[PDB]
From a paper:
HOIL-1 is a RING-between-RING-family E3 ubiquitin ligase and a component of the linear ubiquitin chain assembly complex. RBR E3 ubiquitin ligases like HOIL-1 catalyse ubiquitination in a two-step mechanism where ubiquitin is first transferred from the E2 active site Cys to the E3 active site Cys before being transferred to the substrate. We identify a critical catalytic histidine residue, His510, in the flexible catalytic site of HOIL-1 that enables this O-linked ubiquitination and prohibits ubiquitin discharge onto lysine sidechains.
To investigate the importance of His510 for HOIL-1 catalytic activity, we determined the structure of the HOIL-1 RING2 catalytic domain with the active site C460A mutation in the presence of ubiquitin. The asymmetric unit of our structure contains two copies of the HOIL-1 RING2 domain, one of which is loaded with ubiquitin. The ubiquitin Ile44 patch interacts with the HOIL-1 helix, with the ubiquitin C terminus pointing into the HOIL-1 active site. The ubiquitin therefore mimics the donor ubiquitin as observed in the E2-ubiquitin/HOIL-1 transthiolation complex. First, ubiquitin binding alters the angle between the RING2 domain and its N-terminal helix by 30–40°. Notably, the conformational changes are not restricted to the N-terminal helix, but ubiquitin binding also rearranges the HOIL-1 active site. The biggest differences are observed in the protein backbone around the active site Cys460 residue (mutated to Ala in the structure), in the active site loop between Gln455 and Asp461, and in the sidechain orientations of Trp462 and His510. In the ubiquitin-bound structure, Gln455-Lys457 form an extended β-sheet with the ubiquitin C terminus, whereas the same region in the unbound HOIL-1 RING2 adopts a less structured conformation.
Author numbering:
A (entry chain C): 1 to 76
B (entry chain A): 424 to 510
C (entry chain B): 431 to 510
Write the structure that this text describes.
């Protein structure tokens, strides 16, 4: 299954997942492709933050759906 | 669908309005601050961001360049009355 | 070893040269490698060509590091 993640304004990346993958699993695929540590990643679909323990299915994320990546960073 | 896309657009709009997120002024990814002081460094492009003014800490020369950015403490004037430390 | 290289390639310790497809092994520490066979410049941190077909300086392909001030990868220190 293919999904899309928005990153920079106007840029997206493509991922290869299955309906049963967990969110923590998807953040690990984002790491391997874009180099962003999982704990810095916050994923949004349909207006809600995704919980690390659910899977794409629980959020009804289907083929060609689009997620939005947000960076959660520690203040200095 | 487009409903899911518009629900995310609205969530992001609200985060921006409430000061809970901004776009990195250099690479334009959306960033949130978790705890700490009035500044963050973007993980993608390494730009230093002044969180309290929601803009770049420095000009295009990088750290130390006060020809742009929030110019905190140039001539002794903080960048914002609530700044405690934007680096 | 022939069998060892098979493993490094799947584990990301080696890659195929983006121009000539020969096996290139990781240079520890470095984000850039020059292919010993075809001499093309390789961006190791993104595992791809450093440049487009015009060679060094040609940002019509490659990783485009530092274009618009954006590094090619959050972990890149210097891919030339
Ligand atoms: Cl900076
Ligand atoms: Zn940035
Ligand atoms: Zn400031
Ligand atoms: Zn300040
Ligand atoms: Zn080669
Ligand atoms: Zn590169
Ligand atoms: Zn680079």
């Amino acid at each position: 299954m293919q999904i899309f993640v928005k990153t920079l304004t106007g840029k997206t990346i493509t991922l290869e997942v299955e309906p049963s993958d967990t969110i923590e699993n998807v953040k690990a695929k984002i790491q391997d492709k874009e180099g962003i540590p999982p704990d810095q990643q916050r994923l949004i679909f349909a207006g809600k933050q995704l919980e690390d323990g659910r899977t794409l299915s629980d959020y009804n994320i289907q083929k060609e759906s689009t997620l939005h990546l947000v960076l959660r960073l520690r203040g200095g | 669908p487009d409903v899911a896309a518009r629900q995310t657009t609205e969530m992001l709009k609200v985060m921006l309005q409430q000061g809970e997120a901004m776009r990195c002024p250099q690479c334009q990814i959306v960033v949130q601050k978790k705890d700490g002081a009035d500044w963050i460094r973007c993980t993608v492009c390494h730009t230093e961001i002044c969180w309290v003014t929601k803009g770049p800490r420095w000009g295009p020369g990088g750290p130390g360049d006060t020809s742009g950015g929030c110019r905190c403490r140039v001539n002794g004037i903080p960048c914002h009355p609530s700044c405690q430390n934007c680096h």
